[PDB]
Design a protein around this nucleic acid. Structure first.
Lengths: 220, 252, 104, 53, 106
RNA sequence: AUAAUAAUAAUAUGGUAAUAGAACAUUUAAUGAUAAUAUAUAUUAGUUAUUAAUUAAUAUAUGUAUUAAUUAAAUAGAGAA
RNA sequence: AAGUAAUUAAUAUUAGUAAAACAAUAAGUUAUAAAUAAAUAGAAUAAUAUAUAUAUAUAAAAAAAUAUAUAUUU
RNA sequence: AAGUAACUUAAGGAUAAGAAAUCAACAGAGAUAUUAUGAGUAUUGGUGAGAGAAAAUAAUAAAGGUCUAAUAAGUAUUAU
């Protein structure tokens, strides 16, 4: 005979749903688990109600602001890149700076890189890779570990569109026959960050034109 | 000294015989991988696939009228007190005999459940493997592959009957007769059959139509787990089987 | 060559049909009655002395220009000098940074 | 195996073919499965009632 | 690259019913990314930790016995082999030890 | 190292509201032999630690079980208004 | 004649998959770091908290809390 | 609750919308519509109850751009 009339679920998968209002010996008899006679018996008191004491959520003071300008950043710890190399997963060539295009492509960080990647230092001891990295930013300790390894970090600015283009340049080419140009940092805070040598920002490390223009303006 | 003494490497290819259609004649072996055609028969996975498919299939046309849907007036039939009878509102109540249903379902009852794609693929493989084990998986081909024994003169390598549409002498036609002869030969007249084609074999389906109640001709894309398992013997094209394998292979 | 031209996107092809490259259209705003009147610029009507809006509104013009850039057919389109829009690499290079960027 | 099938009249399943590595093994299988059913038609395996005794 | 290889290149030992894989032997296939299928699992609301071992082909009982022999420090009781899916559950977070034991062969 | 049943010992096995576990009847869908020597239904008399099913006798239909069984769906069970 | 349906969120158990999953064109969601009102801060410089991470504070510390390191990542 | 019920009027096979004084952000995109995602997120609220986008990314979708106006003033705006 066909198997189709002898298939069961795996043991522990299914259950019988508790069926109310269906006789006394069932257990869930006349009252059907409701108790006896109150409001909840016939209706439902507000789930977050509290009788009269200030509804807790109101008792506590309101706290904080939602920094709309914030661009939360994902975290690719040094430990992970090491796991990829030892697993022979980080497939790079002499050079091929490990950017975010390669990063997500390789599968170290994956899912949704919306705003960028920060490189943190959770396996800085056993990190020994002389490859060059490039991300939104890195932790100071992580940077130091990279330097020790014989590597080279560069904090690179990416607007959300520019980041997207970096990650998936072929899509833009397919759509429009042209990948979009990478934007300059318009914001003051961004400019300041990438102008820091301590952060290994690209504007100082590559000696950018924007920074020079700003200096000229200041002079004049 | 020896850490895992009984470790070993599993077998990776099962031979399926490639046949000519009208008469199921062995032309070649073809080693299909063990994952497609000889997986361990996990019933739970198979069950999951079947139930999900059944749920997807659902029409869900149950439409009893609730007290709103039901078409009485909203008027109070007897005044609250001073009637000498029980309290009543409008005539639509579930409590009364002509009134609408309590907790009534409505139009388009959506019964669609979800399954992970990988699980579904595994189930598909599993069903195929079970069929192979049973001896109910007839792979028909020989066009692409290199043969051992040559194809017969009156058979052909694809899954189809010749000159089905031709009907000159009498109302009876040849493809139907051939099909009947085939059925007689392999002792599967009343048994459920499942012809998994690659491209639309119009002549084959015409031949089948007499035995439409038991024979189900399906494309490579539209074939289901249910269809495979219900079948008493599946007749799959080599190319179609390859395609299915490719579809439901675990990715690397 | 003809087949390659035909293979061009629709909007661009339509533009070429209705404003062909044999006519050297003006860089500056002109009379609306003129033959060399640029469809991207706002041309003045000679009687009323009112600036008519460009025959190709600004979005459409931009799209056309981007299409031309894609297929390398820029110079056959009439000039977009006096329309304020720049595009892509030229825009990037020629622009001055904002006062806020240079002088916070 | 094809020759054996042709002479026999019966079909040896694909899985079985894959498994059995010798002619002797094939013979043994045949003796086990097909032969008794051929001898006695009431003893044969029925599809609708697979757990018959 | 080809899903079904040609009849010539496939050896006899590669086929099913050869080399005796069913009788008292096993295999433990690595994941897609190429790691040992041994996982911590925090059941009953983080209260019950257990170590799960997946992707086992062949005789699971034998494999379990071999692992017990390798790791005598874990008790005999705490080795629940669920037969429907063929995976062997251990009570503690004994993942790393299991991995170490397996690595050498799988 | 498992299960099924059976052993010996001990401990427990009242119960409203309520929590948890496990079963059965009914109806539909998937798979599905069988046959008026049967099935379905009813009364009675039995048997099975027994809501149930089954034996027999009998009446009635029906040349027949969506039948046993596994799932999955329930408009799934009424001395309480 | 009466605990039901749709859209959510959470917990359990099982099954697949697994440092990935889902989905596969992309895009996204969840987890992969803890935080902090928030900012550019982020987990051993010689090993178990006597290390380090963030928050208060601060020259750096100590001090609260929470978190992180003991062949192979969770 | 809710611009919902209800009442009125009028038009067509549909109608409505539709070719940017739109979004955005120093990059850019290119009519409208419907759906998913963004996202119960920003925003908002006797800061209670509650209400809640857009960009962008995809689906759907058609030939989808196109002159008809001598270019638009009691209009832009503003105050209320």
């Amino acid at each position: 005979v066909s198997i189709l009339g002898q298939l069961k679920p795996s043991d522990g998968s299914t259950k019988s749903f508790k069926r109310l209002g269906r006789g006394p010996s069932s257990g869930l008899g006349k009252t059907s688990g409701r108790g006896q006679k109150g409001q909840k018996a016939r209706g439902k008191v507000k789930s977050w109600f509290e009788g009269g004491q200030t509804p807790i959520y109101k008792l506590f003071p309101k706290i904080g602001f939602t920094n709309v300008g914030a661009k939360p950043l994902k975290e690719l710890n040094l430990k992970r890149i090491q796991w990829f190399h030892d697993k022979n997963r980080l497939h790079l060539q002499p050079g091929e700076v490990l950017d975010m295009n390669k990063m997500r492509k390789l599968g170290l960080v994956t899912g949704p890189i919306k705003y960028g990647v920060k490189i943190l230092a959770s396996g800085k001891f056993h990190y020994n890779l002389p490859i060059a990295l490039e991300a939104s930013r890195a932790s100071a300790k992580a940077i130091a570990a990279i330097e020790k390894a014989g590597g080279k970090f560069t904090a690179r600015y990416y607007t959300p569109l520019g980041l997207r283009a970096h990650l998936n340049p072929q899509w833009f080419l397919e759509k429009r026959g042209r990948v979009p140009l990478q934007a300059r940092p318009t914001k003051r805070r961004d400019i300041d960050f990438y102008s820091k040598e301590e952060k290994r920002g690209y504007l100082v490390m590559e000696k950018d034109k924007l920074l020079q223009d700003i200096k000229e303006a200041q002079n004049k | 000294l020896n850490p895992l003494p009984n470790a070993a490497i599993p077998p990776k290819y099962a031979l399926v015989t490639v046949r000519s259609f009208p008469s199921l004649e062995p032309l070649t072996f073809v080693p299909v991988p063990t994952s497609t055609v000889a997986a361990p028969l996990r019933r739970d996975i198979l069950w999951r696939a079947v139930v999900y498919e059944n749920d997807n299939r659902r029409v869900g046309a149950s439409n009893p009228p609730g007290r709103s849907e039901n078409g009485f007036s909203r008027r109070k039939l007897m005044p609250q007190k001073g009637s000498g009878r029980a309290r009543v509102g409008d005539a639509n109540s579930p409590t009364r005999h002509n009134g609408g249903r309590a907790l009534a379902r409505t139009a388009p009852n959506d019964y669609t459940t979800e399954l992970p794609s990988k699980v579904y693929s595994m189930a598909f493989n599993n069903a195929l493997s079970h069929q192979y084990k049973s001896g109910k998986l007839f792979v028909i081909g020989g066009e692409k592959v290199d043969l051992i024994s040559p194809t017969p003169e009156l058979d052909l390598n694809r899954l189809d009957l010749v000159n089905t549409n031709t009907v000159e002498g009498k109302e009876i036609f040849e493809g139907e007769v051939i099909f009947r002869k085939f059925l007689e030969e392999f002792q599967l007249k009343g048994k459920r059959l499942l012809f998994i084609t690659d491209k639309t074999r119009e002549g084959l389906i015409k031949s089948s139509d007499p035995y439409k109640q038991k024979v189900d001709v399906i494309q490579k894309e539209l074939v289901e787990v249910n269809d495979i398992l219900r079948a008493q013997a599946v007749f799959i094209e080599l190319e179609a089987l390859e395609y299915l394998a490719m579809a439901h292979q675990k990715e690397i | 060559y003809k087949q390659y031209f035909d293979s061009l996107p629709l909007k661009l092809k339509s533009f070429f049909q209705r404003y062909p490259p044999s006519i050297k259209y003006s860089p500056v705003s002109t009379s609306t009655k003129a033959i060399n009147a640029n469809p991207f610029l706002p041309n003045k009507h000679p009687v009323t002395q009112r600036f008519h809006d460009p025959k190709y509104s600004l979005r459409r013009m931009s799209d056309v220009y981007k299409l031309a850039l894609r297929y390398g057919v820029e110079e056959f389109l009439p000039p977009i000098e006096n329309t304020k829009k720049l595009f892509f690499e030229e825009k990037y290079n020629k622009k001055t940074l904002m006062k806020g960027v240079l002088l916070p | 195996t094809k020759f054996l099938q042709s002479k026999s009249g019966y079909l040896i399943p694909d899985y079985e073919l894959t498994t059995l590595s010798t002619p002797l093994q094939f013979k043994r299988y045949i003796k086990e499965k097909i032969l008794p059913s051929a001898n006695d038609p009431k003893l044969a395996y029925k599809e609708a009632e697979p757990n018959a005794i | 690259a080809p899903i079904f290889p040609k009849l010539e290149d496939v050896k006899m030992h590669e086929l099913i019913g050869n080399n005796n894989f069913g009788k008292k032997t096993y295999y433990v296939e690595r994941s897609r990314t190429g790691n040992l299928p041994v996982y911590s699992a925090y059941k009953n609301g983080g209260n019950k930790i257990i170590t799960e071992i997946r992707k086992i082909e062949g005789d699971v009982i034998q494999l379990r016995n071999d692992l017990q022999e390798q790791l005598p420090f874990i008790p005999k009781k705490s080795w629940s082999v669920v037969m429907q899916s063929k995976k062997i559950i251990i009570k503690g977070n004994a993942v790393e030890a299991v991995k170490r034991v397996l690595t050498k062969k799988f």
